[PDB]
Design a protein around this ligand. Structure first.
Ligand SMILES: O=C(O)c1ccc2c(c1)nc(Nc1cccc(Cl)c1)c1ccncc12
Ligand SMILES: NCCc1ccc(Cl)c(Cl)c1
Length: 328
């Protein structure tokens, strides 16, 4: 009874229990032998990702092989992906398969030819940033409307093919279902994308965590400082935030939600004024910054998770009017 979402708060409560009760979900496991692995793309803590071909139809896909011990978490990710089926700009789950002998499970996703913007293709224009942020917002509004927090929004999870102008939000392995008053694990998101709520151990968070992470991505893109808040550890991460947003404002947020700060922060936070967003503008980024962009960013990167724009409210912001007009 400390906090709840401003939007879609009851939306899982209003659905059949089977929608959100992922522990009860019984996936249909197809045959992984239909997929030929071509190339290893990477590895995470509990998964590895390969480029592959479906040999029955010659389609290129990716296969994400799951360490099989984590049964509840597998069911969670599978059920979330099935619920998100057809959602705008959400990576498409094509199948759920197992090796028919070992029974190791794997997820088959559509392939996206991800651009490395760090050199190869094109450095983003103002319009490009608006466009891709708007497309990312569609995916977040969709999943939030579906009662799902992603909880790991960061650039690596936002796959963009800059030649075809396609965007997909990937890696739903940390995603959860939002339920009013539920206390969630704060050990989610990449350090640089963690909202203050996580950093101060506030467990009654909601979809608005994803809006912090998308604000961090907006800042990094318009100002060309990636990641925007570069902490060396979780404590330093909050200090990096406070050096921008201010310490008095942090204390107001803590008092509103009755939050206790870990006392180790006493030795490191200092005293910081709230900075003007215009302080980040210089010759290398001025062509990406506008009054609109700053107004939007200022409404995303707020301590108080309840005062951040929703995905929809962000979509509706003037910053995206040029994109809306072009999509007409
Ligand atoms: O987890 C998912 O939902 C997930 C879903 C789809 C992709 C993915 C992860 N990772 C990819 N690439 C990648 C690149 C570097 C490291 C790692 Cl582990 C993976 C990738 C590439 C091309 N098309 C789709 C994907
Ligand atoms: N992997 C691409 C991450 C990225 C880069 C630029 C933008 Cl504007 C966005 Cl939304 C996402």
């Amino acid at each position: 009874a400390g906090s709840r979402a401003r939007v879609y708060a009851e939306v899982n409560s209003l659905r059949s229990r089977e929608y959100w009760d992922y522990e009860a979900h019984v996936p249909s496991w197809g045959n992984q032998d239909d997929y030929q692995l071509v190339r290893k793309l990477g590895r995470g803590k509990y998964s590895e990702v390969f480029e592959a071909i479906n040999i029955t139809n010659n389609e290129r896909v990716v296969v994400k092989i799951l360490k099989p011990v984590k049964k509840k978490k597998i069911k969670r990710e599978v059920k979330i992906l099935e619920n998100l089926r057809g959602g705008t700009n959400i990576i498409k789950l094509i199948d759920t398969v197992k090796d028919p002998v070992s029974k190791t499970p794997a997820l088959v996703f559509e392939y996206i030819n991800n651009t490395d913007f760090k050199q190869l293709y094109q450095i983003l224009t103002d319009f490009d940033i608006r466009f891709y942020m708007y497309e990312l917002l569609k995916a977040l509004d969709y999943c939030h409307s579906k009662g799902i927090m992603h909880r790991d929004v960061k650039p690596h999870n936002v796959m963009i093919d800059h030649q075809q102008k396609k965007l997909r939000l990937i890696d739903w392995g940390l995603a959860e279902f939002y339920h009013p008053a539920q206390e969630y694990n704060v050990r989610v998101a990449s350090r640089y994308f963690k909202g203050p709520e996580l950093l101060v151990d506030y467990q009654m968070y909601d979809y608005s965590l994803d809006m912090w992470s998308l604000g961090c991505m907006l800042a990094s893109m318009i100002f060309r400082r990636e990641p925007f808040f570069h902490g060396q550890d979780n404590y330093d991460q909050l200090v990096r935030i406070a050096k921008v947003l201010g310490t008095e404002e942090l204390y107001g947020y803590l008092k509103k939600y009755h939050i206790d700060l870990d006392p180790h922060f006493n030795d490191i936070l200092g005293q910081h004024s709230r900075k003007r967003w215009e302080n980040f503008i210089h010759s290398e980024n001025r062509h990406l910054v506008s009054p609109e962009a700053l107004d939007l960013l200022d409404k995303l990167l707020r301590y108080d998770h309840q005062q951040r724009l929703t995905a929809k409210e962000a979509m509706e912001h003037p910053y995206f009017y040029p994109v809306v007009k072009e999509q007409s």
